[PDB]
């Protein structure tokens, strides 16, 4: 009334699963929009046939023509390269993914500044810190408009990887990882919680231990790499998490959600992306939350802004 | 496979809410139980069509016989009285419904042992920390399968109240309530979190402030007599808390929620039962969390045992 | 994005479970408006609580003041009465509620031509075919914004009963009934279909025999009267209609279901409101369809409203 | 209580969106089996994190081991190849996928009837009507215990194409495509409603044609072709089906739903499988329904029939 138009900027492993699980909670007519040809058709037709399965009505169509992002409300930006030729698996590192997704940022940015400058954007394109300040640039979009992918993703796995040891509830379990996504990415012990509860306590009681802790921390950072080897750079909690962060802001929901966004002074830094807590609604990002650091805590999320510092000189 | 059989006993106001949840999220077959000729048929017949508008399939059947308590997986007890004869909407008090609804808890645990001494209990029922341990001693069941509502509905409102202020998600503000349902419950400021977050950050950046939590405090002590006064004993959230707790269990969700237990040395006390974090799911209370309480947080706790205490010598 | 504004005009039984069902699937902020002083307060605040165990962002707020309207997006009419004075349980007839309600439509009317002229509006108070267009007429809505609560609440009965009988899915089963909402509904025997087949083949099989489904026919005729007489007019089942058609325009589902809409030369009838399969979404009314009936069936229909008619007269 | 266990016993496209799903719907404990080292085990992990997002508890784990079959509750076998080595997307056909599968079938009914012969199972590998028979016949499970997925999937699609075409909600379009899940299904004119009302009302009406109908007709047949030649062999809306038929199983739905079924007289037909409307519940296959077919119509399931007894007499 009148549903929302939603744009995938790129429709590959990322872009499927978002589209089929739009469908299954009916949020919005869907754009599967790619540089390759057919494809996006074909996927789009098949996730179509789902509405009647879903009790669902969301058109699903697919794209090779920049100009469809005409009346978008809200664009989610993938598109780009997954690994960097000639990297093995085991050599695997987001970094090396700069070279590749620089220019393609700038031209999608040029497009949305012609075609739906209102809209809420989305960015996933890998280094995302340094991609989504980008495409804030190209676009010309408010800063209240613009968030990239990172601490909801990470979080779910520290907040699972902890349920499973402590037989709880995932969601149960909250977590704070921040400043960027990445290796260099900062978990906040101090700020863990378990059913509203300071995880200290069962740490105390014996119930997990502090090594636990210790070997659950470094499982988090390297999962990415983990699944790549086994299987292909991770797709399927990606699109939910991205789901979940659109949700919020078309239902106006103001779930408070760890994102990349434009820092102003927070944490001491100006001029740059990085990853904290924010509030999404009907107005994007209604509030950029500052957690109190320690000065242990800032001086990592200092050396996480540093690395996001480098690769944007280098693009 | 095979559908679970929820018992309602009682199918009054907090009944009928619980009956249109359950076929709304297809949990289990339900019989609304009560003493009343006639009322009770009228009500799931009512309900039943909305199996239609719903996509569910859930009987819904009226009862005015114990028996049908046979082969009950779950029992969600609320028969007895909502106020005392006599007394004036302003001097309403759960204390005064001790005398009225101490011989139907005995009755039902007779019925329960004889038909379904297997199922999950929970009491509902005023006041319902001493009715709870009174239908525990009568049904035979073991301590693991009844508990009683207290905390899930309390910290309802204190996390709504706060949710408001701070333009947030309501399920995104995290809180603790215990000891007792009723007038000395105990709300804990030092376990308040928004977003996993402390609520003394909030504090300390002025987006709330001590005295507008202290009345946020008062507030939720007092919604009952609230709303009493304006309408009715409250029916609406009572309702969705019990399912909440009968879903967990029902789906193995393992869900923290508070609620009344039998402690069994935790906070010091033993042979008493008393509202403290559970851990819910197909075995019942799972866990008993025990929170590490500081000395002025724990008398408190000991003031609303004692009033538990008090009645249950009066009953 | 920004949320619905939906109306509740009328806060008794059937107010406050479409309230609880808005809050369960977030589908937009609620006022519930009633003339009675307090009671609307009270359980919009109960109600409102639910927010946190639903996981949803709705606002709840009661209200005696009619300016309320403005800025509303749906308008949903229950004032009135459920039962004339003087009447025993008995004799209760729909049509006894005309001289109580027909100034009720008209005050009601002025309001909302005055505060939101632009918003689509379901007439539930009976007799309902009557009321609607009395309503249409006051508030000078265009025709594709008005429609009455009869058939999908009827057709709910009628499915559910023969779902019963052959064990299967409620909504598998598919039906009309048409012409007005009373004791001159028509029940369509030729437009019966279970999983999408003709009702006959399982006639024709022995499944359900002709006699059993004349006693299916006036059990769904009589179901109100049957409620009335074990309990109260019927709330759980009209609330749940009622919001299955404001849930298909506010998130345009496109959903055929049966209503009282403007009549235009459809079955032979111009100039008043009566009982149709209609398409709701974004638009509103998109498309009214309308049945190829035989001359017994149309014969059936003209009964049904030459009694809206009657009524219409003494109104 | 205790949660279902469901094993997918093929862990590549389809086995993907499957244990996706089933996260989303909370519908048990998921095992991906597959004969690929590494690959499941990355997959699960993946798919395990959106508990979090979708407020679920259920595990999800990988599989290399066929004994992982013990205590499974449902089977779900995609197993095997989707296409033929040399064959172009062109000339992609079922029928080519006989040598390549039929002796996977017959290693994963000896494991089934070992682990765990009291499943549900749902075979899906092609050509399908084939291949559930000779399962049916390895595993020794009782007939009502085993199904072939086929009409769920292949009514998805005309129902779709119809709804779009007339503007309303893709579920209530109803069809039936009966016999065998290929190139000579049958696509029954006469059994096709829209709201529950004959398509030819629709037809009669000018709202669509004969013409544009025999052009859907071709465009469903056609489908997997059509997708194939642009992207791959389809899996989002396979998933959907399969996922819409264990769901009516393990909750007791008993929703009609069109599957390949063993058929003992029915349409003429015995010792084979072919597609026909039955009824999922708690008890498997509760009911065939046996469409009362034309001559003209059975004229086609016969040929249907025979094509999957040819296939069957080359395995
Ligand atoms: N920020 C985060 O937490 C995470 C970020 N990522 C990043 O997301 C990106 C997408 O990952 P996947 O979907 O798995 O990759 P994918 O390779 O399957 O899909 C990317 C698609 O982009 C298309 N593309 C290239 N140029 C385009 C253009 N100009 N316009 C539209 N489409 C274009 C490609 O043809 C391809 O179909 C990667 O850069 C990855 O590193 C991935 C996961 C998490
Ligand atoms: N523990 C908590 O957080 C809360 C507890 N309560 C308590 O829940 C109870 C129910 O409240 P409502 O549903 O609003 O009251 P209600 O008065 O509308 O319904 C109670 C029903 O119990 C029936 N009843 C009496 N004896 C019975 C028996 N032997 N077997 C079966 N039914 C019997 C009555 O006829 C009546 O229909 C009250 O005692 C109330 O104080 C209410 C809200 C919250
Ligand atoms: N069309 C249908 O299929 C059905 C129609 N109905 C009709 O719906 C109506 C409502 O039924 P219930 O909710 O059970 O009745 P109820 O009596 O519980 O509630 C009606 C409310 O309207 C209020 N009211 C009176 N004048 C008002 C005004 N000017 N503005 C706002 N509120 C006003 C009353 O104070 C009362 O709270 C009845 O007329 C009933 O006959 C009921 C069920 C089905
Ligand atoms: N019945 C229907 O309506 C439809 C049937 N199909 C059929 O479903 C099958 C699966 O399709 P997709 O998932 O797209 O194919 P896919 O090729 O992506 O996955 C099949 C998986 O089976 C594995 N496999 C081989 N032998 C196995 C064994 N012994 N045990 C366990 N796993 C084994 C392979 O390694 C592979 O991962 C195909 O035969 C396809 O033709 C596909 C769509 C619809
Ligand atoms: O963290 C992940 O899961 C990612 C996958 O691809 N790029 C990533 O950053
Ligand atoms: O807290 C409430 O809402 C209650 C209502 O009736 N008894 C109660 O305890
Ligand atoms: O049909 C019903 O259920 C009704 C209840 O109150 N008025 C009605 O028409
Ligand atoms: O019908 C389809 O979509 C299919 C895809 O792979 N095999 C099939 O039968």
């Not at 014996?206 to 086994?230: G, P, Q, W, Y």
Request: aromatic letters at 6%; charged letters at 20%.
């Amino acid at each position: 009334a009148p549903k929302a138009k939603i744009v995938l900027v790129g429709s590959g492993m990322i872009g499927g699963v978002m589209a089929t699980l739009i469908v299954q909670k009916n949020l919005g007519d869907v754009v599967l929009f790619d540089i390759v040809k057919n494809m996006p058709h074909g996927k789009a037709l098949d996730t179509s046939h789902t509405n009647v399965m879903a009790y669902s009505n969301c058109k699903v169509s697919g794209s090779n023509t920049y100009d469809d992002l005409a009346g978008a409300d809200v664009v989610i930006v993938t598109a780009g390269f997954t690994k960097a030729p000639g990297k093995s698996d085991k050599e695997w590192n987001r970094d090396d993914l700069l070279p590749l997704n620089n220019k393609i940022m700038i031209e999608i940015g040029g497009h949305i500044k012609k075609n739906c400058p209102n809209a809420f954007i989305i960015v996933v394109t890998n280094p995302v810190d340094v991609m989504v300040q980008l495409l804030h640039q190209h676009s010309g979009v408010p800063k209240n408009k613009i968030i990239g992918l990172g601490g909801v993703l990470d979080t779910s796995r520290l907040k699972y990887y902890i349920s499973q040891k402590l037989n709880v509830c995932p969601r149960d379990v909250n977590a704070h990882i921040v400043g960027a996504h990445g290796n260099k990415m900062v978990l906040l012990k101090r700020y863990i919680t378990v059913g509203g509860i300071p995880l200290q306590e069962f740490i105390n009681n014996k119930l997990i231990s502090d090594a636990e802790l210790e070997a659950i921390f470094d499982r988090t950072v390297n999962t990415a790499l983990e699944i790549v080897n086994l299987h292909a750079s991770p797709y399927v909690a990606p699109a939910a998490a991205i789901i979940e962060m659109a949700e919020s802001y078309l239902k106006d929901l103001k779930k408070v959600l760890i994102c990349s966004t434009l820092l102003e002074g927070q944490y001491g830094h100006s001029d740059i992306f990085g990853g904290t807590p924010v509030v999404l609604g009907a107005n994007g990002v209604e509030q950029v939350i500052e957690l109190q650091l320690n000065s242990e805590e800032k001086a990592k999320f200092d050396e996480a802004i540093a690395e996001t510092k480098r690769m944007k000189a280098l693009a």
